[PDB]
Design an enzyme around this catalytic site. Sequence first.
Site, PDB file in Angstrom:
ATOM      1  N   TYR A 152      65.670  74.036  79.446  1.00 33.44           N
ATOM      2  CA  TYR A 152      65.203  75.393  79.191  1.00 33.44           C
ATOM      3  C   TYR A 152      65.528  75.766  77.761  1.00 33.44           C
ATOM      4  O   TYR A 152      66.460  75.243  77.183  1.00 33.44           O
ATOM      5  CB  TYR A 152      65.853  76.377  80.165  1.00 33.44           C
ATOM      6  CG  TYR A 152      67.241  76.783  79.766  1.00 33.44           C
ATOM      7  CD1 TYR A 152      68.268  75.843  79.713  1.00 33.44           C
ATOM      8  CD2 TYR A 152      67.547  78.110  79.429  1.00 33.44           C
ATOM      9  CE1 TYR A 152      69.561  76.209  79.333  1.00 33.44           C
ATOM     10  CE2 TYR A 152      68.831  78.494  79.057  1.00 33.44           C
ATOM     11  CZ  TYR A 152      69.826  77.531  79.002  1.00 33.44           C
ATOM     12  OH  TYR A 152      71.083  77.874  78.610  1.00 33.44           O
TER      13      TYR A 152
ATOM     14  N   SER B  29      74.475  84.603  79.834  1.00 32.35           N
ATOM     15  CA  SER B  29      74.947  83.264  80.175  1.00 32.35           C
ATOM     16  C   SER B  29      73.782  82.393  80.661  1.00 32.35           C
ATOM     17  O   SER B  29      72.728  82.899  81.034  1.00 32.35           O
ATOM     18  CB  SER B  29      76.096  83.315  81.193  1.00 32.35           C
ATOM     19  OG  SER B  29      75.619  83.053  82.507  1.00 32.35           O
ATOM     20  N   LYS B  30      74.032  81.094  80.728  1.00 33.77           N
ATOM     21  CA  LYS B  30      72.985  80.080  80.844  1.00 33.77           C
ATOM     22  C   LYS B  30      72.386  80.024  82.262  1.00 33.77           C
ATOM     23  O   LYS B  30      71.222  79.685  82.441  1.00 33.77           O
ATOM     24  CB  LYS B  30      73.549  78.708  80.442  1.00 33.77           C
ATOM     25  CG  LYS B  30      73.903  78.546  78.944  1.00 33.77           C
ATOM     26  CD  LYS B  30      74.974  79.484  78.381  1.00 33.77           C
ATOM     27  CE  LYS B  30      76.332  79.193  78.970  1.00 33.77           C
ATOM     28  NZ  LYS B  30      77.275  80.289  78.626  1.00 33.77           N
ATOM     29  N   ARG B  31      73.193  80.362  83.263  1.00 29.62           N
ATOM     30  CA  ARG B  31      72.754  80.358  84.660  1.00 29.62           C
ATOM     31  C   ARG B  31      72.317  81.749  85.138  1.00 29.62           C
ATOM     32  O   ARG B  31      71.939  81.909  86.298  1.00 29.62           O
ATOM     33  CB  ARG B  31      73.869  79.827  85.562  1.00 29.62           C
TER      34      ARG B  31
END
Length: 440
Positions: free
Chosen positions: A14, A212-214
């Site tokens: 992503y 954040s990434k999640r």
Amino acid sequence: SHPRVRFAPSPTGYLHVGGARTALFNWLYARHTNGTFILRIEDTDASRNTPQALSVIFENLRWLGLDWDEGPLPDGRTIGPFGPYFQSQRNDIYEAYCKKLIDKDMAYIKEGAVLFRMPRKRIIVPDIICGDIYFDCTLEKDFVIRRKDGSFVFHLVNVVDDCEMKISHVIRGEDHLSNTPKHIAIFESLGIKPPLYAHIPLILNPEGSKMSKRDKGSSVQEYIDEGYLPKAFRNYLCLLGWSIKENREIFDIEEAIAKFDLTQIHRSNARFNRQKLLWLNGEYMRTMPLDELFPHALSWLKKAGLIDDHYDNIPFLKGAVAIVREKVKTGKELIDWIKPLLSNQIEYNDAVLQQYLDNEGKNILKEAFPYLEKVSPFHSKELEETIKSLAMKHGRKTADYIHRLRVALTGRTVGPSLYPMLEVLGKEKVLNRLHKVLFE
């Protein structure tokens, strides 16, 4: 004409919004200064660096209108004379630099790994964005540049490739600022002038957290999937730490290029405002050229509502997109609002049925049905004159017909302009649906 800047991501599957902004800022600066924008890929670990992840970076950047002057391209291609642009294909170069450092006594072998001799002096990083940043490096210990397994550390890698690729300005996020003294030290231990640095404060949520990434909404693909518009998302990306002095928030990328300056990036953190972005996408949705919007809409529609361009009534589709577009904010909203227009069955819930299609409602619609079938042409103006006349004849309001009409035809309480909607559907579709509602 001179500057050479780079975006150097890791393919993880992503493109992070912040990564997208960093790529945009580098692209903007290159285009502003008639410089050159390079793309290099940091493909360190084989497990998480799949070709699928690479495609995401290519497609997300292209979707934003951001090209690159040098770097990899799909299907094993490359352009640029300062390649190769993959970290995994530059290991010999890293060794030559690392061996040169040892030969200069600037580094030394220790227990199977190489350690750079950290200059323990004061170092001021003259950051273009953050201003001068005093570091005291007397405490800083030496660090690994090549690890025991022979792999090379980011701290050495990024300096090596900035040298080899003749990078003039390093534009990256402010999470790298604390290690720039290490990077400046390596340049100096090689007798090479360090590049100028421009560190961008990190984007924060309105409540202070990092994206954040999640988390949801951390990735560019998510907004594409949700029906955001390229030019709109990119316009909003420019707003994240930068403005034009007018501070009108809507401008095209040509204006952004003409006015972009690193020294005008805000010193304080950008706040990711989802409501402003949503609002911005609605402005583009409504005002962009229809023929430019249509291809997006089809693509949104293909994820459900329409067949793979075997839809034979293109003209009707354009009509339904044109009327939904002036009121909705995203592709997702369009799909919701256009659903009843395209559908054959209608999705009625009981609450709307007891309020609008009761016995009093049916009788109201029964008042209109005979005139809706006599009206010619079945056009927006004539249809509105018929309803106005109906309202006067029966001592009602036009709203008494308008709302119930929308409910009977679409099962919805809000939607596109009622009279254009009547036109786009056409007499047969309108009458057949009214007939079914009234006489089933």
